């Protein structure tokens, strides 16, 4: 139930920037990054209120329909009804998430080299996907 | 084979901007826009040298695995190896292809209201998809 872009064709070293608006009464949204729908390096799920979590980010990886080990982040810079811009980066070392004033990290489990897949759903309205 | 984006979710009046680079030795490339992969409001195919055509654009529409009436327009503002930006709009009457220096029109055959689907392949490298 959301935007899905396959075979983006990023090159090594290129970072994926995503822009959109968080819904007025957002409960949560997710952004999935990886090689394809069944090989997600980063599952980025900010939750304002969902599954018992309040204002925290749930990050994870997904391989062949099986979730990896969850990691929560309580630094929650997201506001409802607000416009956000997030740039994702990747290297053999790990994945980086950069937001104005914050920078998160996540191990590069799947050993991906670039982001070729990106989808999103939830209380977020996508408005831009660009890379360089 | 190339980038495919589904369910972009554009609202009435929003224009889709596409950015990328035309290959240095490009023969041709295509951009398909519509509701989904089987309901293409506009099949945009610039041809430098392909299938007998030289320096011209072929446009068409598609419905259930079957192309509409092909149309060829001869004003060719593209250059090989050049970065380009194209913005597509759609209204009840026609669809608009905005290039720097030229604006093209194509009939709104399927009566679509917005662009929810976009894909591309050929001698063009996508680097950005945004709307507003």
Curated annotation (Swiss-Prot), chains A, B:
A beta-D-galactoside binds at residues 43-47, 51, 60, 67-73. Mainly in the intestine (adult), mainly in the skin (embryo). InterPro entries: ConA-like_dom_sf, Galectin-like, Galectin_CRD. It comes from the Eukaryota. PROSITE patterns: GALECTIN. One of its GO terms (molecular function) is lactose binding. Keywords: Acetylation, Disulfide bond, Lectin. Residues 2-132 form the Galectin domain. Transmembrane segments: none annotated. Homodimer; disulfide-linked. (Microbial infection) Interacts with newcastle disease virus protein HN; this interaction inhibits viral adsorption rather than internalization. This is Beta-galactoside-binding lectin. The gene is CG-1B.
